[PDB]
Nucleic acid binder design. Structure first.
Ligand code: MG
Ligand code: MG
Ligand code: MG
Ligand code: MG
Ligand code: MG
Ligand code: MG
Ligand code: MG
Ligand code: MG
Ligand code: MG
Ligand code: MG
Ligand code: MG
Ligand code: MG
Ligand code: MG
Ligand code: MG
Length: 74
RNA sequence: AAGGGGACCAGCCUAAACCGUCCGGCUUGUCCGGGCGGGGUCGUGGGGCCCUCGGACCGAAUCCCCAGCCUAGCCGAAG
């Protein structure tokens, strides 16, 4: 069973990673402990949506630097 | 059972893509979900979206009217 880690987990994976676990481990441990969520298509895109936002919002912060950098230093 | 001969005769609505819209969620958005409306319904495959061309017939199983029919009856020849 594929799930999306919501946390870093020992020898499983880092947050946002999609890994294969036994259906039982997910159903009766991971899911009700909020440590992960099932790797369905509905929230697969919802995952990608925020990787994308985090991607954009990061590079906007870098663009602000180079604008501020080229202004000063020159 | 197919086939042949007859009785009767009729074909339709959706799901999904895509658009809209109201709400809900916090994992903040080009988000996810639930409603609702639009769209679409096919096997020669059909539909969706993007270009080019073209701009009235058909009609209900629903509703309305009516005829007819039913639920009482009546006239009816000649010792
Ligand atoms: Mg037959
Ligand atoms: Mg026959
Ligand atoms: Mg026929
Ligand atoms: Mg519809
Ligand atoms: Mg909706
Ligand atoms: Mg709909
Ligand atoms: Mg419709
Ligand atoms: Mg329609
Ligand atoms: Mg239609
Ligand atoms: Mg064919
Ligand atoms: Mg086609
Ligand atoms: Mg009809
Ligand atoms: Mg009499
Ligand atoms: Mg008499």
């Amino acid at each position: 069973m594929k799930v999306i880690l919501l946390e870093p987990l020992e020898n499983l994976g880092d947050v946002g990673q999609v890994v294969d676990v036994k259906p039982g481990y997910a159903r009766n441990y991971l899911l009700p402990r909020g440590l992960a969520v099932l790797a369905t298509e509905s929230n697969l895109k919802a995952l990608e949506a925020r990787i994308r936002a985090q991607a954009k919002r990061l590079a906007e912060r870098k663009a602000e630097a180079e604008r501020l950098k080229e202004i000063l230093e020159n």
